[PDB]
Amino acid sequence: EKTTTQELLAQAEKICAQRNVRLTPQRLEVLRLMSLQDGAISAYDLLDLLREAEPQAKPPTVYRALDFLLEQGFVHKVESTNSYVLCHLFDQPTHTSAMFICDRCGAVKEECAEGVEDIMHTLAAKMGFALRHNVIEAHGLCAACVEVEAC
Amino acid sequence: TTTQELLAQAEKICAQRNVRLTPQRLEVLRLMSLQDGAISAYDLLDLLREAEPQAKPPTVYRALDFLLEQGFVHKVESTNSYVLCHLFDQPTHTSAMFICDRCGAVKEECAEGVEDIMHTLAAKMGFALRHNVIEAHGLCAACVEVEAC
Amino acid sequence: KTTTQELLAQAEKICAQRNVRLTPQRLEVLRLMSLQDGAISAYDLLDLLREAEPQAKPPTVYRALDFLLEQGFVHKVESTNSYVLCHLFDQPTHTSAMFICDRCGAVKEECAEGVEDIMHTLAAKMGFALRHNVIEAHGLCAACVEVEAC
Amino acid sequence: TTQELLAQAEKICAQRNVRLTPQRLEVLRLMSLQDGAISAYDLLDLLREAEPQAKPPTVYRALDFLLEQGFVHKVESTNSYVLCHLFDQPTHTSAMFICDRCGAVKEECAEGVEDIMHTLAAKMGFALRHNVIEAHGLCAACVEVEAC
DNA sequence: AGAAGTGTGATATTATAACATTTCATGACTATG
DNA sequence: TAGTCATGAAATGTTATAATATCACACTTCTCA
Ligand SMILES: [Zn+2]
Ligand SMILES: [Zn+2]
Ligand SMILES: [Zn+2]
Ligand SMILES: [Zn+2]
Ligand SMILES: [Zn+2]
Ligand SMILES: [Zn+2]
Ligand SMILES: [Zn+2]
Ligand SMILES: [Zn+2]
């Protein structure tokens, strides 16, 4: 049974204490707001949610928080949109993942892919290309959306 | 002259399909071809203003849309940027993009295995995938030698 | 001592009087506005701004125009989609008549407090709550008339 | 009342020897059915239901004709077009009162303003060809909504 | 001191919405005549 | 035997803003000598 949202937050607090990094109230609040989402969320949508608690929040507030949360591996940037999602796999050591993005209902599943990382290394190796990071993002329809089509 | 050939080839493909490769569109294509690899729209607009001083953002974006709709360029989603497709006349294809974070060069490769892993991974879930975005950041060969010294 | 210096100093003073930031970028756009004979489109103004600020893009000139509009420093000429420096920043808000030549493109700002009153009376008859008047005349200026006579 | 103006328009396009085509008529019809100002591209959307192959030049050529006759006025400060109050009168200068909340536009006469403008021009060397007179604010209805 | 964090206004970058005209081909009623 | 007038259809020009992201400064704060 996968790690719960709440367990991911506890784990984030303790990981930051283990590293000597400061999971501040803002960064924490930003983190939980993202955990509440059923998928990715844009920075300015996130800013709007943040305002309900902290009305004085501006874009720098959100972006600083996201940068920190990104550097610590709690959040991933979904590049093909311009959105951000909670990482559901930081309890393990740092990882490769592939994002599966629904175009209509907007939800995303993060799924590990060992074979993908390796194939990309293999393609990178043949050319003289020192691969550093992979971006794997899939677009289509998720299960629930498929059964709305069947109507 | 590799550019000349490349342009002559695009004029031919656009003649085949009932489609207008206008001077403006041709010019943008020429500029990107001469570019090593990736280039932002606004850097491309700056170059375009050499030949067309009145060019504005819609000008460059309209040309990109055209060149995107035909097979000639790809968006590089992880750097808001654009590059020539390495082989034109083929239909809508999923390619793996290896982008150099130092010099902007981009090698477009086939990645059948990746598509097949995502194909099966989507199938074990209820996911019906239309398109994959596969982009790798790192360093190209030349820049690898340079970073080692 | 020069009109432009004097004019910018006035603006610097008013913006201090009001607790409001006349930034270098806003200063530069205003400087450019003041060197124009008459009216200039936002994009012609951007090209000029690019000479001093090569990175300037459309939002850059639109923000600066919005600021200069909020304050009393420039007017929008609605019928030609362009912008002119206000002749006198000294006044508060004001209704101003704009005489626009459709040959040489020049624009001349005039007062007409009579017009304010007529419009306020007309709006008052109906229940209308007036905020701004747009009053623009199109024709040929004196100069263009001389030329056209030959 | 929509059909009354359409017939009246053809009458006037007989007198002045100019061809009110079905294209122009259709736009005039659509302008009439609208009870207020409308943008060219919103007008294009409506023209497309009748004539799906219509494009921006289609609507602008039409508008240019309807403008050059008496039939429609441009609202310069909103980039939109409004049917004339009544076009049996001699080519007149409208003064458009424009509600910034509901977008209602009320055409009024303001000879006082035109008179003043002509006098100002006269003192300069200005050959005055046309006046644009437009007010922005809240219509009566909107004032009462805001009063609550 | 000194490194990290926040508040605030303005600015920078990427992309598209909204408005209007140019272009060129092509089929339509007319000017003498 | 052309002459203006009208339309059709693609692309372009023009004006303005949406959507996304960072910088610069001032004040702070918790930390390190
Ligand atoms: Zn993850
Ligand atoms: Zn879905
Ligand atoms: Zn390709
Ligand atoms: Zn490289
Ligand atoms: Zn003024
Ligand atoms: Zn003149
Ligand atoms: Zn009227
Ligand atoms: Zn109203």
Residue numbers in the entry:
A (entry chain D): 2 to 152
B (entry chain A): 4 to 152
C (entry chain B): 3 to 152
D (entry chain C): 5 to 152
Paper lines:
Microbes use a diverse set of metal-specific sensors known as metalloregulatory proteins to respond to changes in metal concentration in the immediate environment. Zinc uptake regulator (Zur) is a homolog of one of the first metalloregulatory proteins identified, namely the ferric uptake regulator protein (Fur). Each EcZur monomer includes two domains: an N-terminal DNA-binding domain and a C-terminal dimerization domain. The DNA-binding domain (α2–α4) contains a helix-turn-helix (HTH) motif and is connected to the C-terminal domain (α5/β5) using a characteristic winged-helix motif.
The structure of E. coli Zur (EcZur) protein in complex with a 31 bp duplex derived from the znuABC operator (PznuABC) was determined by X-ray crystallography using multiwavelength anomalous dispersion (MAD) data collected at both high energy and the zinc absorption edge and refined to 2.50 Å. Analysis of the complex reveals the HTH motif interacts with the major and minor grooves of the DNA. Figure 1 shows the final model which includes amino acid residues 5–152 of four protein monomer chains (designated chains A, B, C, D), eight zinc ions, and two 31 bp strands of DNA (designated chains Y and Z) in the asymmetric unit. The three dimensional model of the complex shows the central portion of the operator DNA surrounded by four Zur monomers forming a dimer of dimers. The nature of the dimer of dimers ((Zur2)2) structure indicated that there were two possible orientations for the DNA to adopt in the crystal. Using DNA brominated at asymmetric points indicated that the crystal has an equal mixture of both DNA orientations. Given the pseudo-palindromic nature of the DNA sequence none of the protein-DNA contact sites were affected by this lack of directionality; however, several bases represent an average over the two conformations. Anomalous difference data collected at the Zn edge reveal two distinct Zn2+ binding sites in each of the four Zur monomers: the Zn2+ in site A is bound to four sulfur atoms from Cys103, Cys106, Cys143, and Cys146 and the Zn2+ in site B is bound by residues His77, Cys88, His96, and Glu111. Each monomer A through D has two hydrogen bond donors, Tyr45 and Arg65, that interact with the N7 nitrogen of bases G7, A11′, A12, A15, A16′, G19′, A20, G24′ (where ′ denotes non-coding strand). Each of the four monomers recognizes two purines on opposite strands of DNA separated by three base pairs in an R-N-N-N-Y motif. Two salt bridges between adjacent dimers were observed, between Asp49 from monomer A to Arg52 of monomer B, and vice versa.
